[PDB]
Enzyme design. Structure first.
Site, PDB file in Angstrom:
ATOM      1  N   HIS A 187     -10.228  60.783  62.815  1.00 58.14           N
ATOM      2  CA  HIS A 187     -10.107  59.852  61.703  1.00 58.14           C
ATOM      3  C   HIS A 187      -9.483  58.517  62.154  1.00 58.14           C
ATOM      4  CE1 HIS A 187      -9.433  58.433  57.608  1.00 58.14           C
ATOM      5  NE2 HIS A 187      -8.303  57.971  58.105  1.00 58.14           N
ATOM      6  N   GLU A 188      -8.333  58.597  62.812  1.00 60.46           N
ATOM      7  CA  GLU A 188      -7.623  57.405  63.268  1.00 60.46           C
ATOM      8  C   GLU A 188      -8.409  56.661  64.348  1.00 60.46           C
ATOM      9  OE1 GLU A 188      -5.177  56.393  61.550  1.00 60.46           O
ATOM     10  OE2 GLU A 188      -4.854  58.264  60.460  1.00 60.46           O
ATOM     11  N   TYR A 224     -10.546  56.268  49.880  1.00 64.35           N
ATOM     12  CA  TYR A 224     -10.737  57.657  50.336  1.00 64.35           C
ATOM     13  C   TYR A 224     -11.775  58.399  49.492  1.00 64.35           C
ATOM     14  CZ  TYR A 224      -6.467  56.618  52.930  1.00 64.35           C
ATOM     15  OH  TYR A 224      -5.514  56.036  53.761  1.00 64.35           O
ATOM     16  N   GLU A 231     -12.410  54.066  56.315  1.00 64.23           N
ATOM     17  CA  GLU A 231     -11.933  55.452  56.264  1.00 64.23           C
ATOM     18  C   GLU A 231     -12.992  56.480  56.685  1.00 64.23           C
ATOM     19  OE1 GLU A 231      -8.863  55.817  55.957  1.00 64.23           O
ATOM     20  OE2 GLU A 231      -8.393  53.788  55.302  1.00 64.23           O
ATOM     21  N   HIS A 235       0.979  57.070  49.949  1.00 60.60           N
ATOM     22  CA  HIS A 235       0.209  55.854  49.654  1.00 60.60           C
ATOM     23  C   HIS A 235       0.701  55.164  48.383  1.00 60.60           C
ATOM     24  CE1 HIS A 235      -2.249  58.214  52.347  1.00 60.60           C
ATOM     25  NE2 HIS A 235      -2.943  57.131  52.632  1.00 60.60           N
ATOM     26  N   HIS A 289       3.547  59.118  58.927  1.00 58.63           N
ATOM     27  CA  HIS A 289       2.196  59.121  58.383  1.00 58.63           C
ATOM     28  C   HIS A 289       1.240  58.436  59.362  1.00 58.63           C
ATOM     29  CE1 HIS A 289      -0.803  59.488  55.217  1.00 58.63           C
ATOM     30  NE2 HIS A 289      -1.263  58.339  55.677  1.00 58.63           N
ATOM     31  N   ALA A 290       0.206  59.160  59.794  1.00 59.37           N
ATOM     32  CA  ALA A 290      -0.704  58.693  60.842  1.00 59.37           C
ATOM     33  C   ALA A 290      -1.377  57.376  60.468  1.00 59.37           C
ATOM     34  CB  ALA A 290      -1.768  59.743  61.128  1.00 59.37           C
ATOM     35  N   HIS A 292     -10.989  54.233  62.961  1.00 57.12           N
ATOM     36  CA  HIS A 292     -10.413  52.921  62.638  1.00 57.12           C
ATOM     37  C   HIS A 292     -10.400  52.061  63.893  1.00 57.12           C
ATOM     38  CE1 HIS A 292      -9.195  53.818  58.582  1.00 57.12           C
ATOM     39  NE2 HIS A 292      -8.308  54.725  58.940  1.00 57.12           N
TER      40      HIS A 292
HETATM   41 ZN   LIG Z   1      -7.650  56.067  57.505  1.00 59.36          ZN
END
Ligand SMILES: [Zn+2]
Ligand SMILES: *[C@@H]1O[C@H](CO)[C@@H](O)[C@H](O)[C@H]1NC(C)=O
Ligand SMILES: *[C@@H]1O[C@H](CO)[C@@H](O)[C@H](O)[C@H]1NC(C)=O
Length: 597
Positions: free
Chosen positions: A350-351, A490, A378, A480, A320-321, A354
């Protein structure tokens, strides 16, 4: 007391430094375990967490030496208050160790799920990422899809019921030790707003009619493909046909539900492969998007220590990324089992959002090195992904060719985007509505599984492919839920990312509601130092101020609002309402027959 406040300021500076130092090592241990699941790595991760929890208890006690409620500095008072909040570290050491063991058992379980191949049941080494996800995303064999759904949920969900029950108990115990009614209130505390949940109810209620229209159209089109026996006209949609294991987004079935199948549907995966894209190139492109906005380039540590493709040595890991802050200077990393697809390109951004956030706030004191709220964290990368996904951007970078952006192509593209962004909203809401209900003691253990599917029916109008019962336990089959990661972040993200996107687009000269040449759904903020400045102003604050102050630094707004997301999809709403009436498309659903109490 003026003297005491000066001493307290030095005390906090040193404490924050020490917390960052110790959290760095906790993070190394967690990274080792997550990138290589072993009993040895588990034990080190859990020992260091236990030692840190003991330290936090001491810290919380030490704060009582300072009369900090009488201090002048709101900043110091904010830091002290954040350091009094123990969370799980409030538990007695034996309970804390048991909670850590429980969490590890669930995470390990999820990571190690293997299933047998449908066509040859002797091959039993198919993992969620990539093998099972490939089948669910691409197969249009409804029996094959149902087989993988069942095998995965049985192994990822039902197998950890007892660990999950004990986790709920310890989570509840921890919450009450911190003077919260339950873990729901503990989670909601992160938004620093006593009306936050109601604000989300109100925004969701505004967008729900659009969801109902999208749901109805998709069901109509699925029924035309699969027939009545497979997809009923009036029932919840069998979730295994929606292209995603959790039905949380439906873009993988765009080729069976696109409004105009004769007209282009953007899927750049093939062109990425044709041009020899690699995971490295994908991350380099993400880095380039951020630097184009005059934001921070990825440091050398990122390239040296990130894991950006699945290991080939056959070890177990969490695929999971995820994005990791190591709480030093410039030690930031991503772990992603990256594949060369359009969807994965969005995940990369997305990553990297962060990561950008980590870099922007790395000179804040340790307690403020986190998001203004969990949803802000997020949202950052998704704002860039919205731009990346536009025909405008994809044409510019050479991934989309021979594309005429006529009205039908626009509807296809808005619809595709809605299958990611609107469809997710009720899904995300239910992930925490379910857990909150368990945390609050509102559902008897005898009814936990059908409580999950009842919520999924009520909000999303989807259901399992086969009848489930209380002998199954399906919630932990979502990462999650097994990993104890709060999910409301999210939902918050998917609302506020459109607020950020609209504002960044205006600042870039890419959106004007009165100009037909600058529609919000074709905005590309690539190259905009003005959009970057707004991000810098917000992101550099970390958690130093309540989130409305961080929003205000971005665009002057203080209120979370669904105006922007509605505005984005307004052209789709108009078309879709007309199309459903034209085709006599049934809207809404009967209660599911798929969970036996
Ligand atoms: Zn995220
Ligand atoms: C996985 O971790 C174990 C220690 O628990 C070690 O023996 C092994 O070499 C590790 N593999 C990798 C690729 O780091
Ligand atoms: C770009 O960012 C740098 C570093 O934060 C800043 O000093 C400078 O003002 C920015 N340049 C432009 C053109 O906005």
């Amino acid at each position: 007391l003026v003297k005491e406040e000066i001493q307290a300021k030095e005390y906090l500076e040193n404490l924050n430094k020490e917390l960052a130092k110790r959290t760095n090592v906790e993070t190394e241990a967690a990274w080792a375990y997550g990138s290589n699941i072993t009993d040895e790595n588990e034990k080190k991760k859990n020992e260091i967490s236990a030692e840190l929890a003991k330290f936090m208890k001491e810290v919380a006690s030490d704060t009582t030496k300072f009369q900090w409620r009488s201090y002048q500095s709101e900043d110091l008072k904010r830091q002290f208050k954040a350091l009094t909040k123990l969370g799980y570290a409030a538990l007695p050491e034996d309970d804390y160790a048991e909670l850590l063991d429980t969490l590890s058992a669930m995470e390990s379980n999820f990571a190690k799920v293997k299933v047998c191949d449908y066509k040859d049941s002797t091959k039993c080494d198919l993992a969620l990422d990539p093998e099972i996800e490939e089948v669910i995303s691409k197969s249009r064999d409804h029996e094959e899809l149902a087989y993988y759904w069942r095998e995965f949920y049985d192994k990822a969900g039902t197998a950890v019921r007892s660990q999950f029950e004990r986790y709920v108990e310890l989570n509840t115990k921890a919450a009450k030790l911190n003077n919260f009614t339950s873990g729901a209130e503990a989670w909601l505390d992160e938004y620093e707003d006593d009306t936050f949940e109601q604000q989300l109810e109100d925004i969701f209620a505004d967008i729900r009619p659009l969801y109902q229209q999208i749901h109805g159209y998709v069901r109509f089109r699925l029924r035309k493909h699969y027939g009545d026996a497979v997809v009923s006209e009036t029932g919840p949609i069998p979730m295994h046909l929606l292209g995603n294991m959790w039905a949380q987004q439906w873009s993988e079935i765009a080729d069976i539900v696109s409004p105009f199948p004769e007209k282009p549907l953007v899927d750049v995966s093939a062109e990425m492969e044709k041009q020899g894209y690699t995971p490295l190139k994908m991350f380099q492109m993400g880095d380039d998007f951020f630097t184009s906005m005059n934001l921070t380039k990825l440091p050398q540590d990122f390239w040296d220590k990130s894991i950006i493709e699945k290991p080939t040595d056959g070890r177990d890991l969490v695929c999971h990324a995820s994005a990791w802050d190591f709480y030093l200077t410039d030690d930031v990393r991503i772990k992603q089992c990256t594949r060369v697809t359009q969807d994965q390109l969005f995940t990369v951004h997305h990553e990297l959002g962060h990561i950008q956030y980590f870099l922007q706030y790395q000179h804040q004191p340790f307690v403020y090195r986190t998001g203004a709220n969990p949803g802000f964290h997020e949202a950052v990368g998704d704002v860039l992904s919205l731009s990346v996904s536009t025909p405008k951007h994809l044409e510019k970078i050479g991934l989309l060719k021979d594309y005429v952006r006529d009205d039908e192509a626009r509807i296809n593209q808005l619809f595709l985007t809605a299958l990611d962004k609107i469809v997710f909203l009720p899904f995300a809401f239910t992930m925490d509505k379910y857990r909150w209900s368990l945390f609050r003691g509102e559902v008897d253990k005898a009814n936990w599984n059908c409580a999950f599917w009842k919520l999924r029916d009520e909000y999303s109008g989807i259901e399992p492919p086969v009848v489930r019962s209380e002998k199954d336990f399906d919630a932990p089959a979502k990462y999650h839920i097994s990993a104890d990661v709060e999910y409301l972040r999210y939902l918050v993200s998917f609302i506020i990312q459109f607020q950020f996107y609209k504002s960044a687009c205006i600042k870039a000269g890419q959106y004007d509601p009165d100009n037909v040449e600058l529609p919000l759904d074709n905005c590309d903020i690539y190259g905009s130092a003005a959009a970057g400045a707004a991000f810098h102003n917000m992101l550099s604050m970390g958690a130093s101020k309540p989130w409305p102050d961080a929003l205000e630094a971005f665009n002057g707004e203080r209120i979370m609002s669904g105006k922007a997301i509605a505005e984005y999809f307004e052209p789709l709403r108009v078309w879709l309402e007309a199309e459903n009436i034209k085709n006599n498309v049934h809207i809404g659903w009967t209660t599911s027959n798929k969970c036996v109490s």
